[PDB]
Every structure is written in C-alpha cells, then in structure tokens.
Amino acid sequence: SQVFGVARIFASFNDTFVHVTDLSGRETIARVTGGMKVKADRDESSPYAAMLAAQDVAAKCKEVGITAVHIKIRATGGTRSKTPGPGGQAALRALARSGLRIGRIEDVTPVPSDSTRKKGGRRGRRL
RNA sequence: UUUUGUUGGUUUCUAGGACCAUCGUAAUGAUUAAUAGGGACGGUCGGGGGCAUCAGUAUUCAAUUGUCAGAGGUGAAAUU
Ligand SMILES: [Mg+2]
Q1: In 3-state terms, what secondary structure has residue A36?
Q2: Does the keyword Ribosomal protein apply?
Q3: Which residues of A103-120 are buried (b: 16+ CB within 10 A; e: fewer)?
Q4: SS (H, E, C) A40-103
Q5: How is chain A split into domains, by residue range?
Q6: Whether CATH 3.30.420.80 fits A1-127
Q7: For A8 and B53, how far is CA from C1' in angstroms?
C-alpha cells in the first residue's frame, strides 16, 4: 500500500538539502535546498528556509505519487564537522507536518576511518 | 777449594749450585656465590624496530548514472 522513498537530508552548516529518491537511489523525486527557497545568502541553513524546502519536496512527492519516506541524514562529513546542521531537524519536522509518512530513520554521515588531512593547518582557523 | 812436594791434567772422596725422576709427609691446594653484573633455561608480555599484506576508506579527478537553479564559502558579513 505505502509507496516509499528515501528522504536524504544533507544538513551541512551554511545549507540544507532535502533529496527524496527511490530505494535503489538512482531515480530522484525532488532535490529541494535551503538556498533555493530563501534568497539571502546567509539564510540557507537557517531553519525556516529548510522547512520551506522540505514542504516543497513533500509537495513534489505528492504530485508524483509517493506516500512514505526513509529519513537518511548526512552531515558534511570527513574533512568537515560530522555534526548535523541547524536545519536537518527543522526539515524533518516540516516533513512530519506535511503528512508524508516516515519509516526507518538513520544518520549516514560518512564518518571515516582515519581521515585524509583536515582544514586549517596545524595552528587551525584563527578568527 | 783443600790436602796428595809444585805446575798441567784425569777421576775421586766430598761440600755448595742448578735440573728432570720416583718415595714419602700433610686436613695436601678453589672464600663468598653481593636483593652486584653477565650468560643459558622457562613461560610470557608489548601502539618496541625492519621487511610483507589487509581494511575503513576518505577525500579528488575521471567514467557511466540520474534529476533543471543555483551549490561553495562566511565571523558576524560579503566575494568567489
Ligand atoms: Mg584539486
């Protein structure tokens, strides 16, 4: 009965994605991003924008013909953060509100075994 | 060297060297085995070293793959 997707929320700092796909992954549905719904450069990762994006994605899904999703969350990963952004949670909330159903939530952030050299240099990033 | 008369011997008796035998004598002869050290032995221990392979991969470029407005980046903010 329930037609599924995989939500894929790439929640980096300074932008969020919501990238709904089929179960194989190849054929997408909607790729809606934070910077797409709020033209302010700053307001990309910002929650409201993320929420809007999520809503848009949901709408797209509805148009297509899908009922449920599998939340996968990706923080920037590897050389950066490994910390889910400000607007992943917000996006999720938005999705929930939309009524597009939810099943099996994961964080598939690519946390390495032993990364190749990080940002900054040795003395780091000195504001 | 001392007497055989005194020189040149030769061999003694002998008294002092020295050197291999064999007989005896004696309680016949190696201090400890350092909570020093070395070394053997025994089971072990270890991200100790060398050489050899395996993973995670992770990033990147590229390949094929999909989807049409921005994604990167921000320190508050921008460029890019
Ligand atoms: Mg490069």
Answers
A1: helix
A2: yes
A3: eeeeeebeeeeeeeeeee
A4: CCCCCCCHHHHHHHHHHHHHHHHHHCCCEEECEEECCECCECCCCCCHHHHHHHHHHHHCCEEC
A5: 1-127
A6: yes
A7: 37
* Spacing, Cα A116 to ligand 1 middle (Å): 14
Structure tokens at A61: 């899904």
Nucleotide nearest A31, from its CA to each C1': B67
The one-letter amino acid at A28:
T
Q: How were these coordinates obtained?
A: cryo-EM
Task: Give the pairing type, strands A9-12 and A28-30.
Answer: unpaired
A22: nt with nearest C1' to CA: B66
**Closest by Cα among A75, A36, A76, A70 to A56:** A36
To one decimal place, what's the resolution in Å?
A: 3.8
